[PDB]
Each structure stands twice: as structure tokens, then as C-alpha cells.
């Protein structure tokens, strides 16, 4: 079955520097990466490196550097001529292939991974004579580059002097090794890191400064097998000899065991049979792209997880968030739900329990970003390591999909106490005026507060700027309103919490629109999103909370309700199923009540205002600031009253509003602060999309979420063609933006593929 997907995406290239960027510093070749490991191939590209897999891609812990173009590149020499082969490449769904041909020599190569840090190489050469063969290999000099524009002259050793690349010959093949480098944002090592081929056959490696040249002689045809291996730590390389030494010894049961693993996602994974072979070939993209994004157990992380991107600039290594973790883990269920299931219990294995050394009143919290080091008040020098906030709860949902593939009711029952304690928190820290409804906010935190708790905050006015503390201080310097702008930590990490970090709803809106908006009879204070501590009866800060109550954020803690009673009931616990369903439906009517305006047909977040409305919602509904995507979340949720969603999805299906060239975007054309080219403000996302369809049909619409779907897959650019996936599109004219291989988008393209994608 994998044969007849070649070259899904182009995974084709010889890299020149470490960092080859493309124009938002993301690799811009797709190397292959399989079984969670730690390294990953790409295909020759021609002449120049026909004969091996260039592109040798590390995952130094937390980011993607290239070490080398050409490495163990494969000539062939026949009485001192080189063979003039012709070239032949391709990859499949879990492997490379190359072959050469030439009249009376041919070789063909196979690449497939064999454990979570080695891949295997079988090099076949058929041939009438003997013949001498050589292998080569160089590491990169050059740093980094935009697009082939180097950035700068720096070179590799240059920009960090302890890394101290060293190829040295071994009995069995070479190896390189790396000094330890803690280069926060760019480059780590623990300075027991390698990069070994071990051979089925005797060769004689000569090195010279960074590059190397290999040597064996055959009487004729021969197949000989290579492993390739980056290992992160000392333990790492001891471990893996017994792997490398009994892979060699059975090289074709490896093989069959990737090629049956892949058959395998493919069996599982592409149900639809109403789909075109387009589409069935977006869903296997999608499947590729999710699987090479797989990284097995590393450093802090002790769970196969995924990341949203292993080429993106700050999304590889073992990166891994909550938010994009319930996408996910949603689509791989019903492919890969092995490392679906290991995706969630990585995002709780660092769930704050009773008693942490950290956060003590985060109990039941889930970080924002876990990787393989932790933060440095965790004893760890990682930069990335993230507590000030968390993401928007899909949890249950995403651990219901789980069970619906596997009915697995061992998993409920793994899982359940981790929602439940996450739920809770939600309850005790982000719901700053007690009514059940909670906020997006943030966490208290080095970065936001002073050692004795005082909110930190720096208020600006031309080039002036003032770094002062307390919330009654920014209080004061709120109403007093004398400044250009007001920057709080603790606020930023609020935005973060919401996962859209620019959007209309927070307040988010340039210069331009808004003198626009004030200019056209609103006030800019319309604008501004004030904030809150939250504190326990004794007084303890727990964090904070946004003065405004989200409706996605309602309308996602309502499915957290309905999943939680859905679970309680698999796992015969009625009186607590009881609850949930209690507390979901107090949740629906707050939704319908509060944040639905009859005037506009649509749904708003609304102001925690500074006294409830006589109805007991705490503020109105957020009109002015326009609409967003957010407005379909109580549809996605199953939220909303029937006569509501018919409201929203007159809106969604205006052209004039949401019904777009690609459909479905993060602001309504309508809204004050629309731009077309803006992430959380009119770019479309697939999750929000494919949201905004579940919506539609839950309440009725499957005709016309069929039809959007129709529309999207005509009108998304590079959908048919062999791109990496990305993040976003122009809602006016299908363009893409955003890092390259985006899991996130290839879970929802996914789901689409299963959902709504079908011959017309
Ligand atoms: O399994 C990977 C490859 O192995 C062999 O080279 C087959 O000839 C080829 O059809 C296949 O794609
Ligand atoms: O999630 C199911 C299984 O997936 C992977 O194989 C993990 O290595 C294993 O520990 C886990 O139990
Ligand atoms: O699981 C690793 C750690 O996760 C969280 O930080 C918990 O609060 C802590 O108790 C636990 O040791
Ligand atoms: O909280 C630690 C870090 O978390 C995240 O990775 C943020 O991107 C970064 O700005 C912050 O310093
Ligand atoms: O640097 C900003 C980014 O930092 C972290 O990755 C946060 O999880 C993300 O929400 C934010 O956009
Ligand atoms: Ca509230």
C-alpha cells in the first residue's frame, strides 16, 4: 500500500548550513524522522549527492541543526573510472528509497528506521566484476542562512567554540562526537552526544580535519546493511550497541517490521472510501507528518510525545504543549493511537500534585510547554520550559477519542483523576468572581510578580518607560489612562493561556484600526482588557484571571463537563456523572443567556463588569470588538440552543462575514480589527475550521459543512501539491503561512479527510 504514496511531500535537498532557514526561520527541507527517533534523512537531489541521504538533521534536545550535506555518500569504481549512474528517488510512508543505474552495475538503497535513535540502510549492489567502493562525508561550515541568503559569514565552530565536532574512525564504521553546548535558544548538548555508522563490512576510513573517506573493495555483488545513530547521552550510546548489534544480524526483520508498522497506518488511518485520491493523498501527508513529528522518551519528557513541528524554529526537539496535544492525539487515535495515548500522558506526566516544590497552589495544573529540560527552578537550564500559564482545556474530548477508537476502558480509567484534578484547578484559579465560569490567565510566577507577590507591570509613554509593582498601582494608572501602553507579564501569558495571542476579543488591535474605530464614534477604551489577582480566603495569590469571561473558554469547559460525565458513567460512577451534567448545563445556560446577542445573531466574550447585570452575567457581551471564531465554539461544544446555533451559522455562511475565499477565519470580515494577513485576526486555521463544521452539523447543517469542506479543499493553496503542511491561509486569497510540517494542521486536515472530504 505505501508504494503508491511517492513523494507526498518533497523530501529532497542539500543543506549548506546548520540553520537553512526559509523566510520565518524554519528548516526548509522535510527530512525523514520515524519511530520517535532523534535524527532524521532527506533524499539526494541530483548528481551532488546521489548516493547517499544528505542532510543529516540532529534534534539537539530542543531544536532542529543540520550537521552535514553529503555523509556516507556511496561512489562505485570500477578500475580507477567512477560509475556513471543515473538516479532514481523516492519516499514512501515510513521510508527513502534510491537507486542507480548503471549497464552493468545497479545498487539500490532502502532507508527505514529501526529504534527511537537508530536508522538502517540497505545498500544492494548487483554487479558482473568487482568493483572498489567509497564512501564520503563533510560536516557544515556555514551557520545559517534565509532562503540560500546567509544570514552573516559566521561559521558553525566559529559561533560556538565548545562544540568541538570530531569524526574518528571505528573498528566498524565512524563516528562524530560533540562537545557540550547550552546554547539556550539554538543549540544543546550534553557533551556526551554521537552520531555513529556502524557497517555489516570491513572499511578503512581516513579522516581529514571535517570530513571523511571510507574504503572496501568486492568481488562482486554484495548487500551490506549501515546504521545510523544520534544518541543524546552516554547512557544512550551504551544502550544502543546491543540495538545496533542485533539489527545487523537481522536487517530484514527490521525492515519488515517498519514496512508491516506503516501498512498498518495506512489500513487504519485512510477509511474513507467515498474520498478522491486527492484527498486520500492529503490524509497520508497528514499521517507522515504527524508520525515524523513522533519523539520518543527524552531528557525530562519520559513518554513517547509530539511536537507541533520537528523543523519548526521552535517547535522541535520534544516540545510539546497541551493544546496541541488534544489535536493530536484526536487525529492519531485512529492511526497511531499507541503514541496518541503517549502524546497525553507526556502533557500530565508534569501535572502540579499536592505538595510541589514550585507551585503548590497550582495543584492539578498542566504546563504549558514541557521538554527535555526543565526550567531552571526545576534544576534544569531549559529556556523553553513554560509554567506561566497553560492552554485551552480539550483534554477530555481528546482522551474520549481515544476510548472511541480503542474502547479501551483502562484508559478512562488511567485518565480520569488527571482531568478531574486539571478541572478542579480551572474552578479554584481561573474563576476570579466565584461564579463557575471561568477566564483565561495566568499563573503566579518569577516573571510576573516580585519576590513578596506584587504584580509586575512597566507602563510607557513615548520613549519613557516605568517599571513599577501592585495591582492597585496599575489600578490607578488604568483610570488615569496617561500612558501609549502598559506591558504585564502576567497579562501577555494570559493571551498565551487563550492560544490565539493576538486576537480582536484580548483587545488586540494596531494603531491604524483603532484611530479608525475611535474615529468612527468608538472609545479606545473599548479596547482595553483589564486584570485581576486571584486570591484564596487565607490570602495566598493563586494567579490570575483577564476581567473577562471567554466564550470559547466557557464553551470548552462545558465540554469538559460532558466528557468528564460521559467517563464517569463508562467507569460506573453515576453520582459524580451526576455533577458533571449539573455543572455542564449551568454552563449552557450562562453561554446562552450571557454571551448570545439576538441583535447580531452571534456569541461574544463577555466583560467581567465592576457589578454583575441584574440577569447575573457579569457583563455584557463584548459587541464592539466584533466577531471571531470563538463565536462558534457553544456550537462546536454542543453548547448552544438550536435556535442560537441557526443564528451563528447565518453568519458563518455570509460571505460578507466568515464565508470567505477559504471560509472560517479568526475574524469576521466585518470586524474593526480585521487584516487579512493577521494570525488571530483573519488568517484561517484548520482547527477552527474544522470547529466551525462540527458546529454546522451537530445542529443541523451537514449539507452545507459538506459544502465548505468542498470549498477548502478548492481553495486552500498547495493542498493537491507536495508542500509541508503549514498553519494558516489568507482567507481572501488561500495563501499559506507558518512552519513547515505543523502537526496541528495535519491532525484537523485529517479529520477532515474522515469527516467531510469526498468525490463531488
Ligand atoms: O519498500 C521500499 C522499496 O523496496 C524495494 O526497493 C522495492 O523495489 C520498492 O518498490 C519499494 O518501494
Ligand atoms: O500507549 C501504548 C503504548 O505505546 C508505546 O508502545 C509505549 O512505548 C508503551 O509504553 C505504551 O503503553
Ligand atoms: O511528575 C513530575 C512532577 O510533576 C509535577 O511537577 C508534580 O508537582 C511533581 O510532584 C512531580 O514530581
Ligand atoms: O516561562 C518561560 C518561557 O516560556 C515560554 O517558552 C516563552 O516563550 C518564554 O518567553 C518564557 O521565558
Ligand atoms: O513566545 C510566545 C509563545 O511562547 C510559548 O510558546 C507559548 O506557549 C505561546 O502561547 C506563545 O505564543
Ligand atoms: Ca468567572
Redesign the pocket.
Known amino acids: 500500500n505505501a508504494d503508491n504514496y511517492k513523494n507526498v511531500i518533497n523530501r529532497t535537498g542539500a543543506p549548506q548550513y546548520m540553520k537553512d532557514y526559509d523566510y520565518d526561520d524554519h528548516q526548509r527541507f522535510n527530512p525523514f524522522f520515524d519511530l520517535g527517533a532523534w535524527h532524521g534523512h532527506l533524499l539526494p537531489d541530483g548528481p551532488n549527492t546521489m548516493g547517499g541521504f544528505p542532510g543529516v538533521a540532529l534534534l539537539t534536545e530542543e531544536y532542529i541543526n543540520f550537521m552535514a550535506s553529503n555523509f556516507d555518500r556511496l561512489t562505485v569504481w570500477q578500475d580507477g573510472k567512477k560509475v556513471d549512474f543515473t538516479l532514481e528517488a523516492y519516499s514512501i510512508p515510513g521510508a527513502l528509497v534510491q537507486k542507480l543505474t548503471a549497464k552493468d552495475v545497479q545498487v539500490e538503497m532502502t532507508l527505514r528506521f529501526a529504534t527511537p535513535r537508530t536508522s538502517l540502510l540497505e545498500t544492494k549492489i548487483t554487479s558482473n566484476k568487482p568493483l572498489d567502493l567509497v564512501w564520503d562525508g563533510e560536516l557544515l561550515e556555514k551557520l545559517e542562512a534565509k532562503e540560500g541568503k546567509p544570514l552573516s559569514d559566521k561559521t558553525i565552530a566559529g559561533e560556538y567554540p565548545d562544540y568541538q565536532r570530531k569524526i574518528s574512525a571505528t573498528r566498524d564504521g565512524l563516528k562524530v562526537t560533540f562537545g557540550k553546548v547550552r546554547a539556550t535558544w539554538d543549540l544543546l548538548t550534553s557533551g556526551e552526544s554521537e552520531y555513529q555508522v556502524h557497517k555489516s563490512l570491513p572499511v578503512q576510513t581516513e579522516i581529514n580535519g571535517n570530513r571523511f573517506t571510507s574504503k572496501a573493495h568486492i568481488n562482486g555483488s554484495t548487500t551490506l546493511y549501515t546504521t545510523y545513530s544520534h544518541l543524546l547521552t552516554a547512557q544512550e550510546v551504551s544502550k544502543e550497541q546491543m540495538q545496533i548489534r542485533d539489527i545487523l544480524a537481522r536487517p530484514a526483520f527490521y525492515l519488515t517490521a517498519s514496512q508491516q508498522r506503516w501498512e498498518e497506518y495506512l489500513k487504519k488511518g485512510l477509511t474513507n472510501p467515498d474520498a478522491t485520491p486527492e484527498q486520500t493523498r492529503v490524509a497520508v501527508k497528514a499521517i507522515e507528518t504527524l508520525n515524523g513529528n513522533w519523539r520518543s522518551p527524552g531528557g525530562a519528557v519520559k513518554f513517547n510525545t509530539v511536537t507541533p513541528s520537528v523543523t519548526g524554529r521552535?517547535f522541535s526537539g520534544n516540545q510539546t504543549?497541551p493544546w496541541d496535544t488534544w489535536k493530536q492525539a484526536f487525529a492519531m487515535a485512529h492511526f497511531n493511537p499507541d503514541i496518541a495515548k503517549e502524546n497525553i500522558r507526556a502533557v500530565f506526566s508534569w501535572q502540579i500534585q499536592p505538595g510541589d516544590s514550585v507551585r503548590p497552589q497550582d495543584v492539578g495544573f498542566v504546563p504549558?510547554?514541557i521538554a527535555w529540560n526543565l526550567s531552571p527552578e526545576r534544576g534544569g537550564d531549559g529556556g523553553?520550559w513554560?509554567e506561566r500559564?497553560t492552554?485551552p482545556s480539550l483534554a477530555a474530548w481528546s482522551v474520549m477519542e481515544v476510548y472511541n477508537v480503542t474502547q479501551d476502558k483502562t484508559w478512562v480509567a488511567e485518565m480520569y483523576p488527571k482531568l478531574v484534578a486539571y478541572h478542579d484547578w480551572w474552578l479554584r484559579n481561573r474563576d476570579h468572581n466565584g461564579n463557575g465560569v471561568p477566564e483565561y490567565g495566568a499563573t503566579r510566577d518569577k516573571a510576573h510578580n516580585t519576590e513578596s507577590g506584587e504584580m509586575l507591570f512597566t507602563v510607557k509613554k513615548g520613549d519613557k518607560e516605568e517599571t513599577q509593582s501592585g495591582l492597585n498601582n496599575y489600578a490607578r494608572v488604568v483610570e488615569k489612562g496617561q500612558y501609549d501602553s502598559l506591558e504585564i507579564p502576567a497579562q501577555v501569558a494570559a493571551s498565551?493561556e487563550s492560544?490565539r495571542?493576538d486576537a480582536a476579543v484580548f483587545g488586540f488591535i494596531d494603531k491604524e484600526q483603532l484611530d479608525k474605530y475611535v474615529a468612527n464614534g468608538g472609545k479606545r477604551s473599548d479596547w482595553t482588557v483589564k486584570f485581576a489577582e486571584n486570591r484564596s480566603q487565607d490570602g495566598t495569590l493563586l494567579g490570575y484571571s483577564l476581567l473577562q469571561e471567554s466564550v470559547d473558554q466557557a464553551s470548552y469547559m462545558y465540554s469538559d463537563n460532558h466528557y468528564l460525565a460521559e467517563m464517569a458513567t463508562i467507569l460506573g460512577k453515576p453520582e459524580e456523572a451526576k455533577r458533571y451534567r449539573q455543572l455542564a448545563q449551568q454552563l449552557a445556560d450562562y453561554i446562552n443567556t450571557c454571551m448570545f446577542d439576538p441583535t447580531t445573531q452571534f456569541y461574544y466574550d463577555v466583560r467581567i463588569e465592576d457589578k454583575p447585570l441584574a440577569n447575573g452575567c457579569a457583563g455584557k457581551p463584548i459587541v464592539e470588538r466584533g466577531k471571531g471564531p470563538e463565536g462558534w465554539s457553544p456550537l462546536f461544544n454542543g453548547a448552544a440552543t438550536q435556535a442560537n446555533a441557526d443564528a451563528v451559522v447565518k453568519v458563518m455562511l455570509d460571505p460578507k462575514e466568515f464565508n470567505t475565499f477559504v471560509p472560517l477565519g479568526t475574524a469576521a470580515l466585518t470586524n474593526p480589527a480585521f487584516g487579512a494577513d493577521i494570525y488571530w485576526r483573519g488568517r484561517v486555521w484548520v482547527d477552527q475550521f474544522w470547529f466551525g463544521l462540527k458546529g454546522m452539523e451537530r445542529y443541523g447543517y451537514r449539507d452545507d459543512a459538506l459544502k465548505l469542506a468542498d470549498t477548502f479543499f478548492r481553495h486552500a493553496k498547495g493542498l493537491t501539491a507536495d508542500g509541508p503542511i503549514q498553519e494558516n491561509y489568507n482567507p481572501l486569497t488561500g495563501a499559506q503561512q507558518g512552519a513547515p510540517n505543523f502537526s496541528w494542521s495535519a491532525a484537523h486536515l485529517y479529520m477532515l479527510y474522515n469527516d467531510f472530504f469526498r468525490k463531488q
Do not use: A, F, P, Q
Open positions: 521552535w504543549w504549558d510547554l523553553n513554560n500559564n492552554k498565551w492560544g495571542d
